[PDB]
Design a protein around this ligand. Structure first.
Ligand SMILES: Cc1ccc(C(=O)Nc2cccc(C(F)(F)F)c2)cc1Nc1nc(-c2cnccn2)nc2c1cnn2C
Length: 268
């Protein structure tokens, strides 16, 4: 994996926490902004294996919709994982701060990009296990990049919760939840239901209702991601294909699913 010399890296601001270190925004040497995850003195053998293993898997991904690794510092302490930096930050916070500001076509385009990144990961035999809008970064072209910042009952498929079966098909369930997050501008899935109430509702057959202003085709697709039977869910190749066809014939997105009102206002 590309080894970066520490003299080329400047840590500027803390932006998060790692498993045994912090996460920073900084600059990498024509300076480019970067995000930097460190592994601090005293880390265990397993932590080092997991940290360098993470850099190793990230280094082999090369896709428009997957966060790009700039390189690693392994020859000096503290060790570092260095990625490109996305000014617009995480998708969930981004949408909540930009409520109502995008077109349907822009929102669906974000979903196609996420789906393309997930198709790539699944094809590379990588199961994400924590796909959610909080783990997707947005650049200044509105391009979404699948990432994993570490630690999600309400995003997780029933078989993964029940017996720890994490596969690309449980990632498809999570993707359906991400579709709902995007189309609602970052609403909390299942609102104030507790984790136990969410699992009970899912087991009883209930599913998230349609977002406001949501294309019928998009709601139909997210519903098929939430089939109880894992084998019936679309594969990521199916999701990408459908989203690409809807975008390329954008009148297909003008037909909206009915929104169930929770509140009735009667006026003359
Ligand atoms: C430094 C770093 C190390 C690893 C990862 C990361 O995504 N790792 C990862 C691990 C397994 C699988 C994948 C995936 F497959 F790509 F998704 C990615 C991301 C980052 N970059 C980050 N960027 C950012 C960030 C980047 N741009 C704007 C705002 N924040 N935040 C991060 C992180 C890590 N944690 N946090 C909170």
């Amino acid at each position: 994996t590309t080894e970066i010399h520490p003299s080329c890296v400047t840590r500027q601001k803390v932006i998060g926490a790692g498993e045994f270190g912090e996460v920073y925004k900084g600059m990498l040497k024509k300076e480019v902004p970067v995000a930097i995850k460190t592994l601090k003195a005293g880390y265990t053998e397993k932590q080092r294996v997991d940290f360098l293993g993470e850099a190793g898997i990230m280094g082999q991904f090369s896709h428009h919709n997957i966060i790009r690794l700039e390189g690693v510092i392994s020859k000096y302490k503290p060790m570092m994982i260095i990625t490109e930096y996305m000014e617009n930050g995480a998708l969930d916070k981004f949408l909540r701060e930009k409520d109502g500001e995008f077109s349907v076509l822009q929102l669906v385009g974000m979903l196609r990009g996420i789906a393309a990144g997930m198709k790539y990961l699944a094809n590379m035999n990588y199961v994400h296990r924590d796909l959610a809008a909080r783990n997707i970064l947005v650049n200044s072209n509105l391009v979404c990049k699948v990432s994993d910042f570490g630690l999600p009952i309400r995003w997780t498929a029933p078989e993964a919760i029940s017996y720890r079966k994490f596969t690309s098909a449980s990632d498809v369930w999570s993707f359906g939840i991400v579709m709902w997050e995007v189309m609602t501008y970052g609403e909390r899935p299942y609102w104030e239901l507790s984790n136990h109430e969410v699992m009970k509702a899912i087991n009883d057959g209930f599913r998230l209702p349609t977002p406001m202003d949501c294309p019928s085709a998009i709601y139909q697709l997210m519903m098929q991601c939430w089939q109880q039977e894992r084998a019936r869910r679309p594969k990521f190749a199916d999701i990408v294909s459908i989203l690409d066809k809807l975008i390329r014939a954008p009148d297909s997105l003008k037909t909206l699913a009915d929104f169930d009102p929770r509140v009735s206002i009667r006026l003359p």
